[PDB]
Amino acid sequence: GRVIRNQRKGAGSIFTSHTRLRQGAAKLRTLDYAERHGYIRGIVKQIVHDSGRGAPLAKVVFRDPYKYRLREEIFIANEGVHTGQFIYAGKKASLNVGNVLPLGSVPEGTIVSNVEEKPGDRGALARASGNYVIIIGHNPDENKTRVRLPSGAKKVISSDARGVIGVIAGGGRVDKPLLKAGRAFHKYRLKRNSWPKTRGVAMNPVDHPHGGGNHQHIGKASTISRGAVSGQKAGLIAARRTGLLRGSQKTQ
């Protein structure tokens, strides 16, 4: 057989990201002294569309504490923020929508987004449009915070990791059907290259584990183990159940 398609996905020739029109890496401010001892105030100057992404982005300009200049950071626009608003980044900032606070300084039940995993990695979780984590509890000794991720998976993280209060704008985006192959074309035109993914059952035995036969069928079980090999992982990798989910998946 030949090299199948998802093994060609990793060599990164035509399968890299189409990143010309992107406005920049959406990132929180770095943990300097002001962010972890008091606060600092920036101004949101522009709310701007970023290609390849569903959420809008917000240019927030700040005053450099150590040099006479201005520093523009590019946040993800939480829902409700408007151009001209003053955004308060720091430990002793207030619980308003838009202010990015450490998770140790917020009460339980606070709805934040763009929340860091390690304190200082500038924004990792709850970061696509509409999403948010819920701070569900504190462990003040060994200071940790149990949050609930958008997939429902619970996660304990550091109480010094930061996050912006509110949910991320552009939400409810995927409730509209694309209706067209043109809209899916232009959707994936600014992300990567995997729009027209021909079913592996219609290919030939070189091209896939599913190809061939005088009927279009998989032939063997489509649930492939975790300890399988690159080239065999075609189907449902490490599937612990299959078929239509009837009942409460919805983990407690």
Partner: peptide, 15 residues
Amino acid sequence: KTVAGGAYTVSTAAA
């Protein structure tokens, strides 16, 4: 003034 909001309405029911 440009305000950030939902994808098809200004204020979503969640936010």
